[PDB]
Symmetry: C3
Subunit: 144 residues, 3 copies
Amino acid sequence: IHHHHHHMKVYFDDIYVSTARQFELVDITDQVEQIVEKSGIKNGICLIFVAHSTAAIVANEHERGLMEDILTKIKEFTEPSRSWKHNLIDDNAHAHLGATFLGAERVFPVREGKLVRGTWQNIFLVELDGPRSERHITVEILGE
Amino acid sequence: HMKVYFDDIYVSTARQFELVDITDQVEQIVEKSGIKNGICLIFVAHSTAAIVANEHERGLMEDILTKIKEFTEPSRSWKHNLIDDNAHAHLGATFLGAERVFPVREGKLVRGTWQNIFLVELDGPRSERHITVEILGE
Amino acid sequence: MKVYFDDIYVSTARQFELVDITDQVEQIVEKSGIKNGICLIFVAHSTAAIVANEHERGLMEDILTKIKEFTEPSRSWKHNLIDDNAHAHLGATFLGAERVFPVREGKLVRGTWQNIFLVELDGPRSERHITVEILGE
Ligand SMILES: [Cl-]
Ligand SMILES: [K+]
Ligand SMILES: [K+]
């Protein structure tokens, strides 16, 4: 269809991650960026979303010490060793709590063809209940 | 052209701290929008409530509220409590956020099997919590 | 469809600070001409965040107090070997760099007591860059 008016483009792609540890941060920034480039959309938004209740999406600086701090703080906050009521059923209440607070998604601007983000703003999958063989991240670009 | 669709969910809350599952209502609105590919924004225009997503299991729901309470400290002499007694609710809402955004893909709200959508009430009872639901897409 | 961008630049004076940017965001929504859509407010920084809550000076103090307590500026975080701001990264990681508001019938949809703040956790900084994008019809 040869459009003649500005119109909404929506482009989807998917990133899969296998996680090795119970708590893990996995940098997905370059994969998200490649999908933004692949979309051909110049101006819009990029939604990065996990359909998982024991993982999350965050954005911060890729420095190995900090990554350890992030996971240490998440662990302290969620209390994996606590007798949460959900642990009667499962053993991952802490993971659900972390994900609930952190959120399943982050939204970035896409501008003049580029993901808008800081020099030290990388995108991470936050695993709180690994190892998992398949964490699925949806990447959606929406715009012109 | 593009499509933007709005609807509204109104919820009365009974307890000071409460989780209210609105998954079905959000799904209905996605369906009624007719939008096949886009996004679904679920947003509360309230500073003492929030929108979260996680598993509808009643133990976990208790856990979430317990954690929120412990984190926000309702009994603490926060400075806002000089004006009114709900500083904790503001803090929890600040941290949790007023909105969540979900993909809409091939006509369906994209969400996990154990990912339900909740209004988080931190200062109830309230007669009217207003959730805006917006679907934007093609 | 229409997509409109503008920028807010904020200089911050204190290590921890909330700066209300509500009016500026509103101005940008107005200027976009967009009637129905979304408003993204995004900070391209890892030691800052965007939140929304009530502009009451006591509560503002409480928010920052809670953030400081949660993030522990005095703790020997591993990142602090490199720069003394691990607490700021932690707060930003939890709070998030973006908020998304509806725009409806030409108005930013928000509550009476829902103001939009840049959260500075590693000030003073001469330039915090906020992108505001309005997308809609
Ligand atoms: Cl046109
Ligand atoms: K579980
Ligand atoms: K209040």
